[PDB]
């Protein structure tokens, strides 16, 4: 069975950005419902069970460009008392939660980034297509594949 609209597809994958593994494992997803980044879904379209491939996905087809306006200076006083405010730390503002990543701390000022963590990055995937099956009515109703465990990290 080939990957296509309304199939539930199981893949194993490795995600690298500039030669570094950021994510890997196994997942199932409902194809054709914007559940994966568009460039990855495009690369998966028409693939067969048992087929391995590589996909280079430019930022535009992944998490989008990095907007300089998303990088801002905010007060250290805005962060929780029991917070570790250090580069890499993630926090939220409420707009729906808006995630931010701390990128620098300088005295009472903190530079933060509201961009997606992979904005502006090109993504390199190794993919194995493991299984392709029809979606159930419940999966179509919910717009995503049924839980099958947390098997990527």
């Amino acid at each position: 069975m080939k990957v296509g609209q309304d199939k539930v597809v199981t893949i194993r994958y490795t995600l690298q950005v500039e030669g570094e593994v950021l994510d890997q494992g196994e997942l199932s997803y409902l194809h054709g419902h914007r559940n994966l980044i568009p460039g990855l879904e495009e690369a998966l379209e028409g693939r067969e069970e048992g087929e391995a491939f590589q996909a280079h996905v430019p930022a535009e087809k992944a998490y989008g460009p990095h907007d300089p306006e998303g990088v801002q200076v905010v007060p250290l006083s805005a962060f929780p008392e029991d917070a570790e405010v250090v580069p890499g730390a993630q926090f939220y503002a409420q707009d729906n939660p808006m995630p931010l990543t701390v990128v620098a701390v300088e005295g009472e000022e903190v530079t933060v980034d509201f961009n997606h963590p992979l904005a502006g990055k090109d993504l390199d995937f190794q993919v194995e297509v493991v299984k392709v099956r029809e979606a159930t009515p419940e999966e179509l109703l919910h717009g995503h594949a049924h839980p099958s465990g947390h098997h990527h990290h």
Partner: peptide, 8 residues
């Protein structure tokens, strides 16, 4: 737009 506070 500036926010009052952030949460973990």
């Amino acid at each position: 737009h500036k926010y009052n506070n952030y949460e973990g």
